[PDB]
């Protein structure tokens, strides 16, 4: 049976893992103590699907999850919370000190000597599965372990596994609001191994989801509990075809074939249709043509990024629930008519529709409610290049002044590592200028 | 987990420290006898940080007390919490410093540092992993200026990779409680540039100002100036001890907060500070805490922050909050104050949000900020110093204890280079 | 035949594209208050037996270009044109005598004009530092006959014996250092930590420095046999050894009735972390001394760029390697030299570019 290995890294990765595994346990019926008392009433069905859940003989279910953060403070919430007895008790903590927001403590100093517990734990976990693999990595750019330790975890998993698909779901630094002053240093050093090893890098952002939680959801004070559920609804309908029974399922290998033209332009900028309130769950039809047109306006992109100032290359409409496959093509010939939704010449096909027909469920405790259908559009546009130039500019403004850099080179890393990461991002931004421009004859 | 050793030098040091371990105790819910009688189970997870265990359910702070020259001994022992410190830690001698630097660093310090470091090593190896060495000392004095910076010359020597925070009470432009005071500041800032990762510049005038201009206290005693310092001292290590939503160690601060290795002299703020009974005419919200933190009359270093550009600042928020009102209030201040910050840094402010408030409050904060406006605390001393040193005024009480004239010119050359590396970034470019 | 020939195929095509005007010995020397020396070593005998591609093109006397095997977004290989400007760009055909035009240097003339000057030696392992300063081009015993430290010893000692300069009655004194993690030792006695203070007349003096009034040329080169006696400072590695501290071998110009010095002349061994930092080694002493080398090297890069791009906040007390050498930089009739060794190989192309951009922070634009 096809399966994934969800490897959360950092505090951002573990905090998202609080709610991704809160969502999975409610869809399948698994209580916070491993049992399945929902399907015992009916008496049939293996709904704790082996994509995400190892099953032991005593009826208990164990996830495929391992997470490393180099700080006990985050995981001790998991080891004392509601999901204490659910997970396996090897949630790898062992950090005698936090990374302190740098890539050099990090890829080199304390990420090493803890990685020996990490890779052996994945080998003890990967060898229980027959069939498809895929590493669902969860981290953030800008942090210390989400940037540094993931970079060590990719070059040590692109060797012991080779050509396996790696979907890594990174939280990207916002161009206007940054919760650290050294976050432009970490989010340029982590690109040098995201570009090489991880085949598909889902970037989301915190400011573009703040506006969604204010405008659509109408929440005036959104905490980090209410942001991570919206990423959790996205991550569910990315790996929904591996579990549920759809009319057009899209495997994790079918992303790599479709979303990714060239081996170094894999940054596809997820979206969703979260216009539930749920006061506005009435007053509104929410048909197939409605939720597909939610991707038109740049007030619903999950990244602070304007798609109208760039081409598209390839999109991937992934539906949920009561979707009829006829209504989809009405909502696609419409989009290919609109002249600001701009494509390149070299991709005339455009779209790809994955219709799963299990409806998205509702986490009790807010903040949206039971809609009958959804969409998670994944589209690598050319417009993500202007989202990086507002981050190379933050790097270059404090690289001329030689600021903050004695805590990077005084931890094992050489000071020449920074310009090696600048010559990628200068040349990787140069790649998006060529691909969007068509050739004339 | 991550563990801190607290050292107390100078008579200013343990007086802050005796109030310090009362704020820490009531934050964890711990009685004078060390017996835990707390409300919840959430404040036992990091007792390990400040309080190592004892035999029957009792907790002892890892508090070395260098400063108990015996005039202060039987007041700290005969105090509120004299039955909480381990009595072998009370390390002292006889014939204290005499408001003299050379009688802290060269003569009585050399015959006491061996008895201190024999207890420092016995409190390091009773720990899983150390990072923190808090030193509560004061400039200007005797023990707190010569012997307080003799240990940092030794403890950083035996531990080159620990975060060394020294909450250094500094002299004042008007309040002159020591005649020799521009000597004990020049000779001690010369030590605290080389040997610390961070050091907090606290003055008594800006603590006298808050108790009159804001807290409206009739007679602010010395307890009520230390009760404001200690509310910052338990505000830097909050994310160590308590869970949060965006944690910050003593090292995520001191990697962000410091651009260049000499520019680590901080000014600490605190909010909410206000004066009431139980009827106060306001509302504790996230935009309410923000304006008070950045207000120029709620610093502690007694310099004008609008005279210079903030290099970078850190706002360690506590209590239950919302991260959008945190990340957007920290944005609008940076835009309204575009000249008051440094232009050539992307985002200056960082955020740190814990999840447990203080006992009585609903929310709180701590403004730790690195500014070029602290050039004024070093220019005033360097004018008072070269006025005294030109006449060779008080030097025969120092050269008569072993020093030389060529260490005084070494110390003023180092402090005058901080002012050069603060006037630069205060200028625009 | 060769597996990697194609990357080198475009390299053989690039060498006919531009105009090769290299550096020949005997050209004029301008002022150049701050010089940056970059030397390319020749191809060794092991490299041709290993299929090694030369990737270091030297087209000018002030320009050096390094190629790199990369790919487009269509998996199409091309060569990146790393374009660097030096002063002083040297060929691999350069013998040490052509380097003697520029490193047996006219700054020793500045020593005798009442000014002071210094010189640096930066590089990686297997790059030519074994043939320049700390041991020279000689083989099984690297003794000082063929490289810089021997020939500069003839520029200092023998030149002042001219009667214009011999009438000044000037003598020679030497003094060796050891710059550890905030520690300024002496190589005459290993257990002598000397404090760095400063007199009231604004001269940073290492307190209590022992000198020797020595000698002719043949004996002053044998002082390093006492200098490298301690094997500074406690190496524990694979390719033993590589110095963790830094050596400052000062040669001082002074008269006899003096108590008056002008013409301090110093050599620096910028030896650091060439091999990657063994963080698998759980020895805490390695990280505590391996870290402070890099922050000392960042001090020396940062200090010189504020000397070229002049300002009034000149960074000195970030470490002690700059603090000891504070007087020799800020002299009025003072100049500064800095040497960078280069490794030819493709397998060390990542370690070569790190050494090149280290010697780039004087802001030289490629006018071309
Ligand atoms: C009815 C009510 O809400 O009363 C408040 C109160 O009125 C005010 C004015 C308190 C009060 O504080 C002071 O008046 C004060 C006295 C000396 C030095 C500093 C302050 C209060 O005494 C202080 C007390 O603080 C705490 O309980 C905190 O946990 C605080 N604790 C201590 O400082 C402490 C005092 C005695 C014994 C043990 C601990 C703390 C703060 C930071 C870190 C750890 C602990 C609080 C909220 C109040 C009173 C009781 C009136 C204020 O101070 C603090 C520290 O909260 C002064 O401005 C704030 C705003 C509060 O609303
Ligand atoms: N959406 C979301 N973002 C988070 C969360 N926690 C942190 N972040 C963001 O992640 C970035 C900070 O990185 P962290 O993950 O906190 O850092 P870390 O990986 O623990 O690394 P160090 O603390 O530096 O060792 C900032 O941009 C935060 O806004 C979270 O729970 N949810
Ligand atoms: N905040 C505070 N300042 C103090 C206290 N006691 C002394 N001072 C200040 O400390 C300085 C005098 O040094 P002191 O600690 O008494 O001298 P020492 O015993 O030689 O270190 C002066 O600036 C005093 O205002 C105190 O309990 N609290
Ligand atoms: Mg963290």
Author numbering:
A (entry chain A): 1 to 441
B (entry chain B): 1 to 429
C (entry chain K): 246 to 613
Text taken from the publication that reported this structure:
Like all kinesins, kinesin-13s posses a highly conserved ATPase motor domain that is essential for their function. To address these questions here we use cryo-electron microscopy (cryo-EM) to solve the structures of Drosophila melanogaster kinesin-13 KLP10A protein constructs in complex with curved tubulin protofilaments or bound to the microtubule lattice. We solved the structures of three complexes covering distinct nucleotide states and tubulin conformations: a complex formed by the NM construct bound to the microtubule lattice (straight tubulin) in the absence of nucleotides (NMMTapo); a complex formed by the NM construct, bound to the microtubule lattice in the presence of the non-hydrolysable ATP analog AMP-PNP (NMMTAMP-PNP); and a complex formed by the M construct, bound to curved tubulin (CT) protofilaments wrapped around microtubules in the presence of AMP-PNP (CTMMTAMP-PNP).
On the other hand, in the absence of nucleotides (apo-state), KLP10A does not form complexes with curved protofilaments, but binds well to straight tubulin in the microtubule lattice. In the NMMTapo complex, the nucleotide binding pocket is empty and the electron densities associated with switch loops regions are positioned relatively far away from the nucleotide site. In analogy with other NTPases this corresponds to the “open” configuration of the catalytic site. Thirty six residues of the neck-domain are resolved in the NMMT complexes forming a loop and an α-helix at the back of the motor domain. After product release, the motor domain would alter its shape to the apo conformation that it is no longer complementary to the curved tubulin structure. This would lead to detachment of the kinesin-13 motor domain from curved tubulin (state 4).
